[PDB]
Design a protein around this motif. Structure first.
Motif, mmCIF file in Angstrom:
data_model
loop_
_atom_site.group_PDB
_atom_site.id
_atom_site.type_symbol
_atom_site.label_atom_id
_atom_site.label_comp_id
_atom_site.label_asym_id
_atom_site.label_seq_id
_atom_site.Cartn_x
_atom_site.Cartn_y
_atom_site.Cartn_z
ATOM 1 N N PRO A 1 0.803 -1.232 0.000
ATOM 2 C CA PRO A 1 0.000 0.000 0.000
ATOM 3 C C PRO A 1 0.829 1.272 0.000
ATOM 4 O O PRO A 1 0.263 2.354 -0.194
ATOM 5 N N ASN A 2 2.139 1.180 0.212
ATOM 6 C CA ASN A 2 3.005 2.350 0.243
ATOM 7 C C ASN A 2 3.572 2.706 -1.124
ATOM 8 O O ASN A 2 4.368 3.644 -1.223
ATOM 9 N N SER A 3 3.182 1.987 -2.178
ATOM 10 C CA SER A 3 3.635 2.272 -3.534
ATOM 11 C C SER A 3 2.732 3.265 -4.254
ATOM 12 O O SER A 3 2.699 3.285 -5.492
ATOM 13 N N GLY A 4 1.996 4.090 -3.514
ATOM 14 C CA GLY A 4 1.094 5.039 -4.131
ATOM 15 C C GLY A 4 -0.088 4.417 -4.832
ATOM 16 O O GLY A 4 -0.680 5.048 -5.709
ATOM 17 N N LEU A 5 -0.452 3.192 -4.467
ATOM 18 C CA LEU A 5 -1.516 2.457 -5.134
ATOM 19 C C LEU A 5 -2.760 2.426 -4.256
ATOM 20 O O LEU A 5 -2.693 2.040 -3.086
ATOM 21 N N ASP A 6 -3.888 2.837 -4.825
ATOM 22 C CA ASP A 6 -5.176 2.704 -4.166
ATOM 23 C C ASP A 6 -5.797 1.358 -4.518
ATOM 24 O O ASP A 6 -5.586 0.823 -5.610
ATOM 25 N N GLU A 7 -6.567 0.812 -3.573
ATOM 26 C CA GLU A 7 -7.185 -0.495 -3.780
ATOM 27 C C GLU A 7 -8.073 -0.500 -5.018
ATOM 28 O O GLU A 7 -8.227 -1.537 -5.678
ATOM 29 N N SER A 8 -8.656 0.654 -5.356
ATOM 30 C CA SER A 8 -9.544 0.736 -6.510
ATOM 31 C C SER A 8 -8.821 0.409 -7.810
ATOM 32 O O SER A 8 -9.420 -0.175 -8.716
ATOM 33 N N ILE A 9 -7.541 0.769 -7.920
ATOM 34 C CA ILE A 9 -6.786 0.481 -9.137
ATOM 35 C C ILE A 9 -6.662 -1.025 -9.343
ATOM 36 O O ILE A 9 -6.912 -1.548 -10.440
ATOM 37 N N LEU A 10 -6.269 -1.744 -8.290
ATOM 38 C CA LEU A 10 -6.180 -3.194 -8.391
ATOM 39 C C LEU A 10 -7.546 -3.809 -8.655
ATOM 40 O O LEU A 10 -7.675 -4.711 -9.490
ATOM 41 N N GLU A 11 -8.582 -3.332 -7.961
ATOM 42 C CA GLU A 11 -9.925 -3.835 -8.229
ATOM 43 C C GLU A 11 -10.272 -3.682 -9.704
ATOM 44 O O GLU A 11 -10.769 -4.620 -10.339
ATOM 45 N N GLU A 12 -9.971 -2.513 -10.274
ATOM 46 C CA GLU A 12 -10.275 -2.257 -11.675
ATOM 47 C C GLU A 12 -9.513 -3.204 -12.593
ATOM 48 O O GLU A 12 -10.078 -3.717 -13.568
ATOM 49 N N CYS A 13 -8.230 -3.449 -12.308
ATOM 50 C CA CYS A 13 -7.471 -4.302 -13.219
ATOM 51 C C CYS A 13 -7.931 -5.756 -13.130
ATOM 52 O O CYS A 13 -7.991 -6.452 -14.153
#
Length: 226
Positions: free
Chosen positions: A1-13
């Motif tokens: 979670p510290n890589s500037g990634l929001d959970e929504s991005i992974l959900e979308e992919c």
């Protein structure tokens, strides 16, 4: 979670890649890439990160459920690709198992994830019996430790995965897991033979339910034997 990634991005992919799994032309190249350099086991490994919410694991388990439902040539190769689970290190597998098996203090999300994991274990059981044997061996000591030190939270739902895993092949798993019950039920006896537990009856209930489940598994093995 510290890589500037929001959970929504992974959900979308994951939603996009599931949608392209739906189509045949895209799932073709999907299988080619995952047989060349990709690994679906990495997605399952990603959920072992305790820093991420259970919703990501829920979506990942639903992704496995969906791809296996679509399976039932590329799909067969994908089913056989999951056989690399035994090659994973014991520490990572133990952490991943404890991530889902642990009773939450997202309780509904945890229950849904557990149901999805049970469905995925049922679907897995072209994978082969080696992965099932390794999983049973890795899960038995952990379940025993949880029933011994802990109050048995999740034990009634833990036997469902183990019995199905032992059901793989001709039934070699019952050769080991039942033996574990030979101790486990006795341990529950050590939990129910105390005067305090007897007076309360007239975590003890959880121990009795776990003993009942272990005895049911032993009886199921005996009925097959006879």
């Amino acid at each position: 979670p510290n890589s500037g990634l929001d959970e929504s991005i992974l959900e979308e992919c994951l939603q996009y890649l599931e949608k392209q799994l739906e189509s045949s032309q895209a799932r073709k190249a999907m299988e080619e890439f995952f047989s060349d350099s990709g690994e679906l086991v990495q997605i399952m490994m990603a959920t072992a990160n305790e820093n991420l919410s259970a919703k990501f694991c829920n979506r990942v388990l639903k992704f496995f459920t969906k791809l296996f439902q679509l399976t039932e040539p590329s799909l067969l190769h994908l089913c056989g690709s999951l056989a690399q689970l035994a090659c994973v290190e014991p520490v990572r597998l133990q952490a991943w198992l404890t991530r889902m098996t642990t009773s939450p203090p997202q309780l509904d999300v945890i229950q849904e994830n557990r149901q999805l994991l049970q469905l995925l274990t049922t679907y897995i059981v072209q994978v082969g019996e080696g992965v099932c044997a390794v999983l049973l061996g890795t899960l038995t000591p952990m379940a025993t430790e949880m029933l011994a030190n802990g109050d048995g939270t999740g034990f009634p739902e833990l036997m469902v995965v183990m019995a199905t895993l032992a059901s793989a092949g001709q039934g070699a798993g019952h050769l080991q897991l039942h033996n574990a019950a030979v101790d486990w039920l006795s341990r529950c006896k050590k939990y129910l033979s105390q005067k305090n537990v007897v007076e309360k009856l007239n975590k003890h209930v959880m121990i009795l339910e776990c003993t009942c489940h272990i005895m049911s598994y032993l009886a199921d093995v005996t009925n097959a034997l006879s």
